[PDB]
Amino acid sequence: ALTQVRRWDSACQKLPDANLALISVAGEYAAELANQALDRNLNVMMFSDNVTLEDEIQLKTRAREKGLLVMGPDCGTSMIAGTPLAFANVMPEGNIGVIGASGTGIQELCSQIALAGEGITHAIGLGGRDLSREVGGISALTALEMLSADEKSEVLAFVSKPPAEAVRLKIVNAMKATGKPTVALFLGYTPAVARDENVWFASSLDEAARLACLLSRVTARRNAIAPVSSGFICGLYTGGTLAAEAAGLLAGHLGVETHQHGMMLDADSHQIIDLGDDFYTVGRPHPMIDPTLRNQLIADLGAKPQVRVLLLDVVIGFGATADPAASLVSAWQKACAARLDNQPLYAIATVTGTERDPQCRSQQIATLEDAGIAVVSSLPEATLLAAALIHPLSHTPSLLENVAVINIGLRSFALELQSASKPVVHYQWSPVAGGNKKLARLLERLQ
Amino acid sequence: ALTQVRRWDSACQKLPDANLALISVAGEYAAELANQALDRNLNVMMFSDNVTLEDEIQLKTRAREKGLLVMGPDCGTSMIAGTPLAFANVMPEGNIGVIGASGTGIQELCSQIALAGEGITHAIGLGGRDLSREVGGISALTALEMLSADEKSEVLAFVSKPPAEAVRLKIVNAMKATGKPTVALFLGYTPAVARDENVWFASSLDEAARLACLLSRVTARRNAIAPVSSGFICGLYTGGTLAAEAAGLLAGHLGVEAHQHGMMLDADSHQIIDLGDDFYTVGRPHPMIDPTLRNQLIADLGAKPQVRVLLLDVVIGFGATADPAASLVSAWQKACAARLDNQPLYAIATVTGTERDPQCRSQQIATLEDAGIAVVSSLPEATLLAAALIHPLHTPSLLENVAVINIGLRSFALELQSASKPVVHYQWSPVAGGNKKLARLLERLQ
Numbered sequence: 069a070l071t072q073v074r075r076w077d078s079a080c081q082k083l084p085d086a087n088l089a090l091i092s093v094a095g096e097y098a099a100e101l102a103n104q105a106l107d108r109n110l111n112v113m114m115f116s117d118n119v120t121l122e123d124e125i126q127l128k129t130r131a132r133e134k135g136l137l138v139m140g141p142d143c144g145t146s147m148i149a150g151t152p153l154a155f156a157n158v159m160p161e162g163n164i165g166v167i168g169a170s171g172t173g174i175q176e177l178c179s180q181i182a183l184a185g186e187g188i189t190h191a192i193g194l195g196g197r198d199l200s201r202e203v204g205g206i207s208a209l210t211a212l213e214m215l216s217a218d219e220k221s222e223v224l225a226f227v228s229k230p231p232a233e234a235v236r237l238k239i240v241n242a243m244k245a246t247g248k249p250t251v252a253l254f255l256g257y258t259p260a261v262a263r264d265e266n267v268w269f270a271s272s273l274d275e276a277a278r279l280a281c282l283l284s285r286v287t288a289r290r291n292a293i294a295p296v297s298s299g300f301i302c303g304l305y306t307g308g309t310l311a312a313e314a315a316g317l318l319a320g321h322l323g324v325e326t327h328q329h330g331m332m333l334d335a336d337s338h339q340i341i342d343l344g345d346d347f348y349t350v351g352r353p354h355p356m357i358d359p360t361l362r363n364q365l366i367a368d369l370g371a372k373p374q375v376r377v378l379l380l381d382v383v384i385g386f387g388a389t390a391d392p393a394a395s396l397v398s399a400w401q402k403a404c405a406a407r408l409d410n411q412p413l414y415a416i417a418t419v420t421g422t423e424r425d426p427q428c429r430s431q432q433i434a435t436l437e438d439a440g441i442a443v444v445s446s447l448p449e450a451t452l453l454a455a456a457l458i459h460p461l462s463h464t465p466s467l468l469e470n471v472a473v474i475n476i477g478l479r480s481f482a483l484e485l486q487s488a489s490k491p492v493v494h495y496q497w498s499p500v501a502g503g504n505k506k507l508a509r510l511l512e513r514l515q
Numbered sequence: 516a517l518t519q520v521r522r523w524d525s526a527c528q529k530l531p532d533a534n535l536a537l538i539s540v541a542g543e544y545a546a547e548l549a550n551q552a553l554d555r556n557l558n559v560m561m562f563s564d565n566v567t568l569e570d571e572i573q574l575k576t577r578a579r580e581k582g583l584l585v586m587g588p589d590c591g592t593s594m595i596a597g598t599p600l601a602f603a604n605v606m607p608e609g610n611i612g613v614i615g616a617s618g619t620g621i622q623e624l625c626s627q628i629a630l631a632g633e634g635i636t637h638a639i640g641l642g643g644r645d646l647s648r649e650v651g652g653i654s655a656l657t658a659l660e661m662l663s664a665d666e667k668s669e670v671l672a673f674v675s676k677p678p679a680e681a682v683r684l685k686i687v688n689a690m691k692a693t694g695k696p697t698v699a700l701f702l703g704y705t706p707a708v709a710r711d712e713n714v715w716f717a718s719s720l721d722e723a724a725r726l727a728c729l730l731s732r733v734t735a736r737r738n739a740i741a742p743v744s745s746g747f748i749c750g751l752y753t754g755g756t757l758a759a760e761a762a763g764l765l766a767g768h769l770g771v772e773a774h775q776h777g778m779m780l781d782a783d784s785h786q787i788i789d790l791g792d793d794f795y796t797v798g799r800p801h802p803m804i805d806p807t808l809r810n811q812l813i814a815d816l817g818a819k820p821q822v823r824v825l826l827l828d829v830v831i832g833f834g835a836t837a838d839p840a841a842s843l844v845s846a847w848q849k850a851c852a853a854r855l856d857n858q859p860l861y862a863i864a865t866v867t868g869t870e871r872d873p874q875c876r877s878q879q880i881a882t883l884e885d886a887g888i889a890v891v892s893s894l895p896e897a898t899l900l901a902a903a904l905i906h907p908l909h910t911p912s913l914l915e916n917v918a919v920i921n922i923g924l925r926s927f928a929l930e931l932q933s934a935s936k937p938v939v940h941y942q943w944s945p946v947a948g949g950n951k952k953l954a955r956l957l958e959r960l961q
Contacts, residue, residue, distance in 0.1 A: 155803065157832035158871035172754030172830060172867065179867045183892065255756065256763045273760060274893045307619030309702065313720060316703045356602065383619060385604035386930045387591075420619065420626045424605040445630070446721040484833040487873075514798070 070479075070486050072494040079474045080108060083493045087467055090153055091116055092477025097499055098141060099123035101476055106130055106138075111467050113139035113146055114195065115154045116477065121202055124195065128206040137210050137467065140195020140203070144171030147178075147191040151471040151490045154193075154481060162187020164284050165221030167211045169194040169228035173255065173273065177227050180277030186284045189221040190468055199231040199239070209242050214465040216246035222287045224250035225280040227273075230257040243267050249283035251276050263320075282449055289442060290456045297410050299376025301454045302369065303332075303340035304362050306355035307420065310381045311342035314447050321455040338458075340379065359389050363399040369413055370406025377414050377454045378403075380441075384421030384432060391427055393435035400441065414457050415441040418450050517932050518939045523551060523920075530939045532918040537600055539563050539923025540943055545588060546570035548922055548943075553577055553585075558913050560586040560593060561642070562601045563923060568649050571642065575653040584657050584913065587642010587650075591618035594625075594638045598917040598936045601927055605934075609634020611731050612668030614658045616641040616675035620702065620720065624674055627724030633731045636668040637914060646678035646686065656689050661911045663693035669734045671697040672727040674720070677704035690714050696730035698723050710767075733900045736889060742907030744857055746823025749816065750780070750787035750901075751809050753802040754867065757828045757894065758789035764898040787826070803835050810846035816860055817853025824861050824901045825850075827888075831868035831879060838874060840882035847886060861904050862888040865897045 073079045080086060089105035091098050095118025102123075105112045112127070119141035131138040139146055145168070146153035150161075157175060160182050168174035174191050181188060192215070194207040208228070215221045224246060231239060236254070243250045244265050251268045252259075253276040259269035268283065270276035301318065305311035315332035319325065324335040330345025341348075343355040343362055355362050369375050378400065382392050389395075400415050407413055417436055423429045436443050444450045472491040475482035482494035500507045520526045527533055536552035538545055542565025549559045549570075559578065566588035578585040586593060592615075593600040597608070602618060606625055613628075613635055615621035621638050628635060639658040646652050655675075662668040671693060678686060678701070690697045691712050698715045700723035706716035715730070717723035748765065752758035755777075762779030765787060766772065773780045777792025788795075790802040790809055802809050816822050825847075829839045836842070843864075850860055864883055870876045880890045891897045918937035921928035928940035946953045 152833045155830075155832060155834035157867075157869050159869060160871075170756045172828075173756035175754070175830060175832065176757060176867045179869060180893070182869050255760065272764075272895065274895065307622070309617045309620035309720075310623060313702065317719075381619075383602075383622060385602065385622065386599045387602040387926070420623045422604050422606060422626060422629050424607075426605075446627070448719065448721060480834070487833070 070482055070492070070494050072496050074496050076104065076108065076495070079493045079495045083472050083474060083491060086472040086474045086491075086493065087111060088113060088148075088153075088471055088473050090473050090475050090477070090481060092154070092475075092481055093497055094499055095119050095141070099127060101497070102127050102138065103130070105474075106134060106136060109134060109136065110474065111137045113143055113153055113193070114141045115143060115481070117142045121197065121200070124197060125203055128198075128203065132206060132210065137214070138207060139193050140198050140207050142197070143193040143195045145174045145191065146193040147188070149190065149468055149471045150488070151473070152484060152488050153473075156191070159191070160187035162284065163189065163220065163222040163288055164280050165189045165215040165218060165224050166191040167194065167208065167215065167224070167226045168192070169196055169198045169208065170255070171196075173227045173253075176273045177225060177253065177277055180274045181225075181280055184277050184281040186281045189218060190215070194228070199228050199235055201232045201235060205231065205235050205239055208239055212242045212246055214468060216248065218464045218468050220464070222248065222291065223280060223284045224248050225253065225276060226250065227253040227276065228255065230254040240264065240267060249287055251279045251283065282452070285444070286449060286453045286456055289453060291461075293414060293457065294461055295376070295414070295457045296460045297376070297412075298458055298460055299374050299411070300336075301338040301340075301377045301379060301458060302372075302375045303379035304365055305332075305340065305342055305379070305381045306344055306362060307381050307383050308342050308344045310383075310418075310420065310447065311340055311344070314379060314381070314451055315340040317447055317451040318455060321452055337374070356383060356388055359392060359395055363395055366396070366399040367402040369400075370403035373407060373411035375413065377416065377457050379450060379454055380415060380417040382417050382419045382421075382432060382436070384419070384427035384429065385425040388427065391432075393427075393432040397435060397439040397441070401439065416450050416453055417441055417443050418445070418447055419443060517928060520939055520941050521943075523555065523941070526920045526939050526941050527555065530918050530920055530937060532916065532937065533920045533939070534558060534913050534916065534918045535560060535595075535920070537562065537919050537921050537923075537927055539601070539927060541945060542566045542588070544945055546574060549574050549585065550577070552920075553581060553583065556581060556583065557920070558584045560590055560600055560640070561588045562591060562927070564589045568644065571644060572650055572653075575645075575650065579653055579657060584661070585654060586640050587616070587645045587654055589644070590640035590642045592621045592638065593640035594635070596637065596914055596917045598919070599930060599934060600640075600919075603638070606638070607634035608636070609731065610636065610667060610669040610735055611727055612636045612662035612665060612671050613638040614641065614655065614662065614671070614673045615639070616643060616645045616655065617702070618643075620674045623720045624672060624700070624724055624727075627721055628672075628727060631724060631728040633728045636665060637662070641675075646675050646682050648679050648682060652678065652682050652686050655686055659686075659689045659693060661914060663695065665910050665914050667910075669695065669738065670727060670730045671695050672700070672723060673697065674700040674723060675702065677701040687711065687714060696734055698727045698730065729896060729899070732891075733896060733903050736900055737903045737907075740861060740904060742823070742861075742904050744823070745905050745907065746821050746858075748785040748787075748824045748826060748901045748905060749822045750826035751812055752787065752789050752826075752828050753791055753809065754828050754830050755789050755791045757830075757865070757867065758787055758791075761826060761828075761894050761898055762787040764895055765902060768899055768902040784821070803830055806836055806839060806842045810842050813843070813846040814849040817850035820854065820858040822860060824863065824904050826897060826901050827862065827864040829864055829866045829879060829883070831866070831872045831874035831876065833873065835874070838879075840874075840879040844882060844886040844888070847888060863897050863901055864888050864890050865892070865894055866890060
């Protein structure tokens with residue numbers, strides 16, 4: 069049974085700890101009700117269109133000095149603490165925090181994330197004009213700071229139309245300040261560089277989602293492992309091309325820059341080695357057919373405590389070992405066996421081959437996983453994870469913890485919130501006096 | 516059991532359909548066996564290493580003249596007509612033809628293609644040095660020509676180290692000439708242009724796979740629909756952001772620059788409209804909450820023959836209509852029921868929302884698919900298919916069946932035997948059978 073009301077105080081008593089005012093009244097009155105909401109120190113989300121820049125700017129600046137959040141006018145979507153606000157979707161729980169100055173942009177970005185197998189913490193709408201040259205991205209900065217302080221939001225994803233020079237610059241620096249892996253989606257804009265410190269740039273919705281999930285998977289694992297002591301990366305590859313791509317990929321992640329003797333990369337003690345090179349094959353069979361060399365080198369890492377991460381490629385199929393996984397496992401266990409607790413050896417592998425190959429992809433992967441080796445589907449993820457693990461680890465907004473809504477405009481919004489069984493009180497509001505049926509009937513008819 | 520032989524005589528008599536000689540003997544002898552194979556008009560694959568550029572060029576130029584193929588020295592991987600050659604993988608059959616001057620590069624690309632649910636026709640290894648300046652892509656050109664002529668190879672994917680300028684130009688041009696959607700992967704090479712006509716440039720193995728699979732899905736769906744008459748694209752969007760991205764993507768595919776009244780795109784009669792714009796919402800609910808208008812416009816398409824493709828978005832979730840799919844199908848059917856068979860209307864929809872939404876993602880997609888509307892997972896694919904459906908419109912004997920005369924290593928023949936592929940093992944050696952000491956010396960030195 070929806071708790072309707074018709075006076076502010078009546079709504080505030082039916083919901084003492086109300087947190088947000090969702091305004092969907094006629095634009096001409098939205099700003100008014102927003103300030104009345106702030107007078108009661110409530111966060112505001114204006115789904116309402118037809119609101120002037122001046123009022124939006126006034127409301128957002130006022131919300132800043134008060135330490136509140138005003139999801140600017142014409143904000144069609146938001147989902148905070150599992151609470152659907154306006155046009156929202158039921159999302160799987162995850163570690164991705166979404167911020168957007170777009171309606172269906174947020175919706176599609178989120179739909180693609182779920183479709184990609186991950187989930188979100190919150191999806192914060194800002195209002196279509198927040199990033200405008202005149203608004204200055206006030207709400208976008210407040211949103212970033214909030215999620216930045218939300219530990220459950222390990223990865224950040226931002227979506228909006230491309231902002232102007234001064235504004236996008238302010239947004240990026242703010243994104244960098246959070247220190248969290250962040251995907252910045254500037255709709256229909258091919259970015260300068262693909263990555264800038266902790267910021268990854270995308271130009272399309274599903275590209276952005278693909279990236280957000282990848283960062284999500286890498287950060288998730290890195291937090292679970294919780295590396296504490298730094299060290300170096302050692303890549304022992306059996307496939308030349310694979311070694312070369314992993315090398316190029318890792319160099320980019322490290323901001324590091326013709327490769328002699330199979331040494332594909334050697335920077336700051338990190339190494340990516342092609343054991344297939346002639347330099348390692350004198351007097352012995354190719355590593356892809358005989359695992360003896362590589363396995364010994366793996367076992368011997370037990371004597372190189374400075375080596376924190378071991379990168380591996382496992383290539384199956386005809387012409388390869390019968391069951392590489394098993395001997396790989398024993399070999400790396402011997403290594404780990406010889407390490408002190410503060411000198412662990414994390415292993416990361418990618419598997420190249422199919423389910424029907426003799427060795428069987430799924431069985432090989434399971435063997436690796438059961439032993440504790442991290443198996444990822446692609447080199448970009450494998451190397452990104454490796455780079456993340458070498459550097460050890462280094463107050464959540466009350467609005468993100470709980471959301472109590474005083475719904476003012478449309479009743480349907482209050483009703484949909486009822487479905488989610490979220491705390492809501494519906495404040496029936498109208499711009500026409502109670503007895504003026506003529507005008508009430510007219511307004512309805514015209515709309 | 517494995518048929519074993521000691522002379523070309525026996526090999527060919529035993530394998531009358533021999534198509535290829537897989538050679539893994541010591542490099543100093545590989546070119547010689549390769550020419551003996553060419554003397555018998557057999558294709559060649561030299562897994563064998565330690566072969567000079569000089570011999571490679573001689574063998575490949577000779578092969579080209581004979582209308583045959585020599586997969587360069589140091590070619591560790593190939594799969595042709597379901598036949599695994601050397602370091603190969605068991606692959607599901609699909610519509611993607613792969614070519615590579617890389618060993619594990621071909622393997623990883625295919626492994627990714629398989630994981631994405633697609634398959635290949637063949638994976639033709641070229642030899643690590645085929646695209647070098649000295650060789651000039653001889654085998655690369657041949658393979659491209661072969662896959663260009665293979666009807667089952669509907670999408671092509673090429674992978675290799677970045678070839679020098681002249682070679683690269685020649686290669687890209689040959690890819691353009693096939694006319695088939697093609698992904699060109701030049702390992703660790705930043706492409707300035709992402710797409711050039713039918714060629715998509717990629718930088719990483721996973722990206723190349725992603726693109727190859729995307730083109731695979733689009734081309735497979737188009738060939739199924741088998742369009743006959745060209746026409747126009749009409750996008751009717753309810754979500755503003757989705758309309759603009761769709762507009763931006765299609766403008767790119769149609770290679771044209773593309774704002775007012777919600778008309779996100781309007782070039783060459785192709786239109787992408789944002790029905791959520793004020794221009795279409797005066798006096799009525801937003802199209803995301805009321806389908807009336809859009810459904811009307813869709814139904815009205817039945818009277819417009821030239822409109823061949825209809826693009827749609829369907830956003831579900833708490834605030835949208837209770838069952839979008841149902842009404843869309845209905846308006847959709849009316850339009851189709853008014854069209855003559857020669858003037859069909861193909862519908863393509865992207866669905867935004869989750870399995871948990873009130874409308875239920877899978878439920879909506881089912882209703883849409885049941886009525887013949889094509890549902891795709893992303894705007895790039897939807898717009899790409901939209902552009903593919905408005906056009907519209909023999910196979911090399913080696914790609915039909917492979918019968919191998921194996922010469923170097925025995926393991927490769929056993930590999931073929933286990934997969935029930937036609938094979939004969941030519942037991943060969945540099946030392947004549949009568950010299951015991953020399954034989955011991957060789958056996959020991961290896």
